Amino acid sequence: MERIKELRNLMSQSRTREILTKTTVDHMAIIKKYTSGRQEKNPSLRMKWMMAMKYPITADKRITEMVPERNEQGQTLWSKVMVSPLAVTWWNRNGPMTSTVHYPKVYKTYFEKVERLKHGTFGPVHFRNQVKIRRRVDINPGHADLSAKEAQDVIMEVVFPNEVGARLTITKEKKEELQDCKISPLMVAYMLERELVRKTRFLPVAGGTSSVYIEVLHLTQGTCWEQMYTPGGEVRNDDVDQSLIIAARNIVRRAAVSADPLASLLEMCHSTQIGGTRMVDILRQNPTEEQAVDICKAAMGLRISSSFSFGGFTFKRTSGSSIKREEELLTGNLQTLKIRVHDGYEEFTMVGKRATAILRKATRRLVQLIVSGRDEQSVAEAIIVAMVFSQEDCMIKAVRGDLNFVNRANQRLNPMHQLLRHFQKDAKVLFQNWGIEHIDNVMGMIGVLPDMTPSTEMSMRGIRVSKMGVDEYSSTERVVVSIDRFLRVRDQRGNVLLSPEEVSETQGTEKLTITYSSSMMWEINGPESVLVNTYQWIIRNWETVKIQWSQNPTMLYNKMEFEPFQSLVPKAIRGQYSGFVRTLFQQMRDVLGTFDTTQIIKLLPFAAAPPKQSRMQFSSLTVNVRGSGMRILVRGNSPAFNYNKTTKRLTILGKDAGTLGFLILGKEDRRYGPALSINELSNLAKGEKANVLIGQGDVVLVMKRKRDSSILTDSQTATKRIRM
Amino acid sequence: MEDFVRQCFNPMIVELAEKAMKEYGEDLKIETNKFAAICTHLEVCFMYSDFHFINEQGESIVVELALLKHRFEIIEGRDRTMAWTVVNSICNTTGAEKPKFLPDLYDYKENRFIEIGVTRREVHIYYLEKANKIKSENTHIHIFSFTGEEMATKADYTLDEESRARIKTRLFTIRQEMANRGLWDSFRQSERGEETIEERFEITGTMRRLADQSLPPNFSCLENFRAYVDGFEPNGYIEGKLSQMSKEVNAKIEPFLKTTPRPIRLPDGPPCFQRSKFLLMDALKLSIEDPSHEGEGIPLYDAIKCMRTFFGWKEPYIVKPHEKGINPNYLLSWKQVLAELQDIENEEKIPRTKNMKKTSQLKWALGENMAPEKVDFDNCRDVSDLKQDEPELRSLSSWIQNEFNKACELTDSTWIELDEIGEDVAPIEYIASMRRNYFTAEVSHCRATEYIMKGVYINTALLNASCAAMDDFQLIPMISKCRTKEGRRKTNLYGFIIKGRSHLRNDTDVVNFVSMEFSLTDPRLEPHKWEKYCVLEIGDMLLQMSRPMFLYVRTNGTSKIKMKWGMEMRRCLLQSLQQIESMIEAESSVKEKDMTKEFFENKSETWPIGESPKGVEDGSIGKVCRTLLAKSVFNSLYASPQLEGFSAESRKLLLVVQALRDNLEPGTFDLEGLYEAIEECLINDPWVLLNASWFNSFLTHALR
Amino acid sequence: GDNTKWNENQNPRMFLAMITYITKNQPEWFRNVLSIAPIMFSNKMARLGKG
Amino acid sequence: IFENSCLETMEVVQQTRVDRLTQGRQTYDWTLNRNQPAATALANTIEVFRSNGLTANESGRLIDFLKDVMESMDKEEMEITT
Amino acid sequence: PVGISSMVEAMVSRARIDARIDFESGRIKKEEFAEIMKICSTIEELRRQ
Structure with a gap:
């Protein structure tokens, strides 16, 4: 009652009631920051003077019945509630020994550091003139890649459930393991926010990328030294974005071949699921910058970085502008090429896979270039893409052979990518045709020769390979994109930013479990997944299939979700199977009521094939997986089609495949009883219109829901009334 | 805001809103709130039209994901011309008068035109506006808010119950999302009836009047100025203004060869005195070698048991006066000190702190005798002498160099209790330990460490007394503690200090004090050194030479900041270490396996530290460590803004000397200006003048 | 380098000019907001203090 | 560069x-x-x-406080209570 | 915190709900509950001026 009594005697004074009435809850954060600010009276000196004083500690009144007044030497530690600091040591000496050694579940993020130090094998100190490499790295171990908002929305649910906002596996796990062994809600909330929230910042490092290397950066790196250190055992989130990268690469590679790549990309993104969370939400809230990821983000309307991608290298404009001034050019082998000649002066910084560089380039003339990489072939590739972008006539005349390079979709590449993909494999002509000059080897800068050999006084015309790395400045920029129907992203100014033609530099392991459920992707997870995914789609959309098979079923057969399954039955007996299943379904339609759903699910995916008048019957149908031929019967269950009769679960090759909060009504209404708390797990017989206090603000009426209401194709069918 | 909308909406509504904003040239980079409002309207319309079909009879039903209409034709999401065409088509079909204002939706069951409005303010005002705007015609109004309220025309909410609550819940969730993101600005934009306009910031009178008076002397209104700035032509005005400017304005480089450096000028005049807060080399210790073990130990009784160990207190026959002021008051105050000390056996309870009597000699020695009284100018308007001073130029003396030389010498005790550090299980930890422990060993027994600890203890005691003794003159002993060579703790007493009134409200507020310190140096040897000191030959001590023991008494004043800068004097250690450690790294950064054990442990490496026989006398490493330590310490206690200015100005000359020594062909602009700046901060400080003589010696021995 | 008496030579009207050029073709309210500080610094008083 | 910086400052x-x-x-x-x-x-x-008569800052926006500052210089007299 | 209601009404609703829950399922004095809700309604009437 003390709080409502304080509200009463506080709402009495006019100037203290006007503030409480006018200011709303949303602005409370701005009303807490009004302080006197008398605090900094040399707090070290004040603390020393207070510790010199007797009984400076403040406690509650429960110490009287818990610790004695006199210790074992007759020393006083009370007052009348001040406390002598000796009482703290007394309580630590012989006090209430309790079973809360449970501690290391809320403080897990510190015992992780302790464990990384336990098995943190060391190494030598190779002193060198350390040069700072400007990287952008995350500093959080094991946080599952959750942003501040979506992490605090989980904190509020697990620690303050009765005042959650008006909006997930961790929400159950943490709520379970620290259910009743709570320590201090604010302390637990702060610790879980430190443990779960991601944070990526721009730091100068000299070899540390993962979270384990940055947490101990003061040990490894210093002023002019480096300490080889290995903690042992990586963290969760340095390889969480890697699976999204692989998924985006595969999605773009599969969309570029499709008829309409943009719509394919959109559907595949909205249907793909990564580690339980849908892809598009991650795309909307993930700070990972990759070419295919930028293609995916641009396909849905999200901002990306002004940086444009060429030869797998991302460029950043430092200074200088340009003008288009299209121009024709003849190659060194009599081939006409229309080209966009970058005119004017420009300064660029290009970041790459394992090599970076600073370029200064004038109109069709490379002025200066400073490159640093790790592998010899890698710096060679960097120098090749730089020479190609240099636009000098030296490399145009160095073109040997006709340039006919086509995309995986049989598409004429741009002349830029033509020259790039030409010089990318054999480039020794361009080196011996470029030119040599003298250097001075100052500031740790060496030269390179045509034979890819370092030299101290000879290099290419305008070239330098830098030791101790190039400074990688990664500035953040966000401008709207202009995606087109062929998955090419351009700036608002009209500069082609990125395109699919340079995405594939590696295969993909998918360190976390990845799931594609659209139509076109059911061929990466072997032929064995085609069946399970087709039948899962059948059981999922069974309710619409049931009526689309009774009426106009020729449209149900030719649905393009059966294309991957059709590719597994041999091309010879495909039409016979299709005709057989179609005549069986026609007999089921003619003799009404005499049809079992099990056989329809068993035999439907064969009807998608072009039927042929087969003068023969079948009982066993063959599907080829990894070359092995599996049979699916027409009577009973098969190892390829195992439908349990009693359990009603459909099992395909051992894998299981299917079987067969609230919303606000308005403001608080005094009719439907008094208000409730968020803790209303009793649905109260499922009708229940009731008013409840949501969040930390007002009260609103609440009812149940009936059908799912999600992000499904209904937004996509909203187009059914437009474009009529 | 602009980025947030792309999250809480699907790409199709974003694309439609982007197409719709391209209708009236509305750039989305500015009108972010209009973009948000249009996206909200589109999503409301979509969730409004979905899931509603018309059965075989004249009623509406809900559907999921076989042949039926939609009961609602979407109007807002289409192009202007197509929307008007559809409206005219359905009006000619049903025979209903078309509204003059473009509606958002048409209902099939009720044959009404439903128009939707999503507002931030009260829904009653929005409905009244839409009514005064659309009245007496059959056009249904449906108004939603983010708070959950809903208002239709005449209580005819033309929907189901759940289908409306889904939209209300979506709106409330969007409200909370843009609320906790700090994006609740649009409450001020849609609060106009027309939900698009952004914040307009006016400039009315008394403000526009200052704007028009802030422009260059070529305009009258700032609007002309802004229109002139908007259309600007870089026609090469820079080159014209350069051609017009006089040729005298130039940074003419004057070369810098080894002949141009001339030694720093030094002031001439009266010898510089000593103003250090306490005696450095002349103070004398009074040991008790007593383990009472420390800290809470009461310092008053330790000082009296220092006095208990000495005999031979002569009658005070004063020697060197102050030359300006009442001299016998000093010896009277000292006699009062001895009397109040011996007068404790009458108190019957030992006080832990001796509060001196408010005696005349002590009121004078602290300057508390009533000064000019605080008056107002209204009554002291005129007096014959109502006047309101730059310092005099004092030349360098020979004693400061000897003070520094003694500060670098080694002593008998240790003077540090440096706590422990955990096990070393790493190579850089090994290197750091080998640096820090060698430094600690070479520096611990140094006299500068005694100076650090002495200043720390004195300032701590004085500041602690300036809190509880805020009203009376308390006697504060000058006690230090150390450990002898044989490993026995020793307590030393350098003298006493009598504190005045210490009402230290601010940090710069000054409290006056009197320092009476023991010594064995005759002031008659160097009388110019003790300008602010009055000397009392106070006894003879057993040494057996039996040399006379003197008491140097001076009146001074200190503030809170002056005291605290001196309680943290052990920083002089860390600074030294870093200025050593830099040399271990920067000078040895060019190495694969760093030179760390060759810096120490190698007495062949000698560093220039002295010049006795007109020639460089280089010393070992420990001399360098102690020299840097004592330099930092003397900078701490002899701290003066002259020293700061001298460091700042001489560092530039040093760097240019180094650039010439590296043969980098350097040059200056106004070397005379640099010399003027250097000579400007050289007046009377012995420490600054000693540093100046040092830099002169360096320039003399740098091939210049 | 270093600029002696660098602080006392910057005229707030010059800041107003360079801001007005930076806020080129921007919405009028933006320029009206950002240009207030230079105008207030053009017409400003300096308090002497205690005496 | 000015337009990007200006958009960031508008945000x-x-x-x-x-x-x-x-x-x-x-x-x-x-x-x-x-x-x-x-x-x-x-x-x-x-x-x-x-x-x-200056109560615009209670909306939470700093720009509203600036509007209050603007309109303050237009009022003839400002009374200060202690 | 997020919420459109004023401080007073939000706090009064929280107090009433907490009183109800710790009186019904929890343990609190009946007359204490009555006085708490009387004070809450008094403050609700106080914020009317």
């Missing part, structure tokens, strides 16, 4: 609360004609504006 001025005005060192309060801490001087100015 700042749209989103900035009055909190960013209290996070500072000693300031000059004209209400007491003396140097006061940031939060105390801000509260003094807020209350002396609210005592008069």
Whole structure:
């Protein structure tokens, strides 16, 4: 009652009631920051003077019945509630020994550091003139890649459930393991926010990328030294974005071949699921910058970085502008090429896979270039893409052979990518045709020769390979994109930013479990997944299939979700199977009521094939997986089609495949009883219109829901009334 | 805001809103709130039209994901011309008068035109506006808010119950999302009836009047100025203004060869005195070698048991006066000190702190005798002498160099209790330990460490007394503690200090004090050194030479900041270490396996530290460590803004000397200006003048 | 380098000019907001203090 | 570069609360004609504006406080209560 | 915190709900509950001026 009594005697004074009435809850954060600010009276000196004083500690009144007044030497530690600091040591000496050694579940993020130090094998100190490499790295171990908002929305649910906002596996796990062994809600909330929230910042490092290397950066790196250190055992989130990268690469590679790549990309993104969370939400809230990821983000309307991608290298404009001034050019082998000649002066910084560089380039003339990489072939590739972008006539005349390079979709590449993909494999002509000059080897800068050999006084015309790395400045920029129907992203100014033609530099392991459920992707997870995914789609959309098979079923057969399954039955007996299943379904339609759903699910995916008048019957149908031929019967269950009769679960090759909060009504209404708390797990017989206090603000009426209401194709069918 | 909308909406509504904003040239980079409002309207319309079909009879039903209409034709999401065409088509079909204002939706069951409005303010005002705007015609109004309220025309909410609550819940969730993101600005934009306009910031009178008076002397209104700035032509005005400017304005480089450096000028005049807060080399210790073990130990009784160990207190026959002021008051105050000390056996309870009597000699020695009284100018308007001073130029003396030389010498005790550090299980930890422990060993027994600890203890005691003794003159002993060579703790007493009134409200507020310190140096040897000191030959001590023991008494004043800068004097250690450690790294950064054990442990490496026989006398490493330590310490206690200015100005000359020594062909602009700046901060400080003589010696021995 | 008496030579009207050029073709309210500080610094008083 | 910087600054001025005005060192309060801490001087100015016809800062926006400052110079007399 | 209601109404609703829950399922004095809700309604009437 003390709080409502304080509200009463506080709402009495006019100037203290006007503030409480006018200011709303949303602005409370701005009303807490009004302080006197008398605090900094040399707090070290004040603390020393207070510790010199007797009984400076403040406690509650429960110490009287818990610790004695006199210790074992007759020393006083009370007052009348001040406390002598000796009482703290007394309580630590012989006090209430309790079973809360449970501690290391809320403080897990510190015992992780302790464990990384336990098995943190060391190494030598190779002193060198350390040069700072400007990287952008995350500093959080094991946080599952959750942003501040979506992490605090989980904190509020697990620690303050009765005042959650008006909006997930961790929400159950943490709520379970620290259910009743709570320590201090604010302390637990702060610790879980430190443990779960991601944070990526721009730091100068000299070899540390993962979270384990940055947490101990003061040990490894210093002023002019480096300490080889290995903690042992990586963290969760340095390889969480890697699976999204692989998924985006595969999605773009599969969309570029499709008829309409943009719509394919959109559907595949909205249907793909990564580690339980849908892809598009991650795309909307993930700070990972990759070419295919930028293609995916641009396909849905999200901002990306002004940086444009060429030869797998991302460029950043430092200074200088340009003008288009299209121009024709003849190659060194009599081939006409229309080209966009970058005119004017420009300064660029290009970041790459394992090599970076600073370029200064004038109109069709490379002025200066400073490159640093790790592998010899890698710096060679960097120098090749730089020479190609240099636009000098030296490399145009160095073109040997006709340039006919086509995309995986049989598409004429741009002349830029033509020259790039030409010089990318054999480039020794361009080196011996470029030119040599003298250097001075100052500031740790060496030269390179045509034979890819370092030299101290000879290099290419305008070239330098830098030791101790190039400074990688990664500035953040966000401008709207202009995606087109062929998955090419351009700036608002009209500069082609990125395109699919340079995405594939590696295969993909998918360190976390990845799931594609659209139509076109059911061929990466072997032929064995085609069946399970087709039948899962059948059981999922069974309710619409049931009526689309009774009426106009020729449209149900030719649905393009059966294309991957059709590719597994041999091309010879495909039409016979299709005709057989179609005549069986026609007999089921003619003799009404005499049809079992099990056989329809068993035999439907064969009807998608072009039927042929087969003068023969079948009982066993063959599907080829990894070359092995599996049979699916027409009577009973098969190892390829195992439908349990009693359990009603459909099992395909051992894998299981299917079987067969609230919303606000308005403001608080005094009719439907008094208000409730968020803790209303009793649905109260499922009708229940009731008013409840949501969040930390007002009260609103609440009812149940009936059908799912999600992000499904209904937004996509909203187009059914437009474009009529 | 602009980025947030792309999250809480699907790409199709974003694309439609982007197409719709391209209708009236509305750039989305500015009108972010209009973009948000249009996206909200589109999503409301979509969730409004979905899931509603018309059965075989004249009623509406809900559907999921076989042949039926939609009961609602979407109007807002289409192009202007197509929307008007559809409206005219359905009006000619049903025979209903078309509204003059473009509606958002048409209902099939009720044959009404439903128009939707999503507002931030009260829904009653929005409905009244839409009514005064659309009245007496059959056009249904449906108004939603983010708070959950809903208002239709005449209580005819033309929907189901759940289908409306889904939209209300979506709106409330969007409200909370843009609320906790700090994006609740649009409450001020849609609060106009027309939900698009952004914040307009006016400039009315008394403000526009200052704007028009802030422009260059070529305009009258700032609007002309802004229109002139908007259309600007870089026609090469820079080159014209350069051609017009006089040729005298130039940074003419004057070369810098080894002949141009001339030694720093030094002031001439009266010898510089000593103003250090306490005696450095002349103070004398009074040991008790007593383990009472420390800290809470009461310092008053330790000082009296220092006095208990000495005999031979002569009658005070004063020697060197102050030359300006009442001299016998000093010896009277000292006699009062001895009397109040011996007068404790009458108190019957030992006080832990001796509060001196408010005696005349002590009121004078602290300057508390009533000064000019605080008056107002209204009554002291005129007096014959109502006047309101730059310092005099004092030349360098020979004693400061000897003070520094003694500060670098080694002593008998240790003077540090440096706590422990955990096990070393790493190579850089090994290197750091080998640096820090060698430094600690070479520096611990140094006299500068005694100076650090002495200043720390004195300032701590004085500041602690300036809190509880805020009203009376308390006697504060000058006690230090150390450990002898044989490993026995020793307590030393350098003298006493009598504190005045210490009402230290601010940090710069000054409290006056009197320092009476023991010594064995005759002031008659160097009388110019003790300008602010009055000397009392106070006894003879057993040494057996039996040399006379003197008491140097001076009146001074200190503030809170002056005291605290001196309680943290052990920083002089860390600074030294870093200025050593830099040399271990920067000078040895060019190495694969760093030179760390060759810096120490190698007495062949000698560093220039002295010049006795007109020639460089280089010393070992420990001399360098102690020299840097004592330099930092003397900078701490002899701290003066002259020293700061001298460091700042001489560092530039040093760097240019180094650039010439590296043969980098350097040059200056106004070397005379640099010399003027250097000579400007050289007046009377012995420490600054000693540093100046040092830099002169360096320039003399740098091939210049 | 270093600029002696660098602080006392910057005229707030010059800041107003360079801001007005930076806020080129921007919405009028933006320029009206950002240009207030230079105008207030053009017409400003300096308090002497205690005496 | 100017247009990008201007867009970022527009986002700042749209989103900035009055909190960013209290996070500072000693300031000059004209209400007491003396140097006061940031939060105390801000509260003094807020209350002396609210005592008069200037109550726009309670919406939480710093730009609304700037509008109050603008309209304050248009009023003929400003009364200060202690 | 996020919420459109004023401080007073939000706090009063929280107090009433907490009183109800710790009186019904929890343990609190009946007359204490009555006085708490009387004070809450008094403050609700106080914020009317």
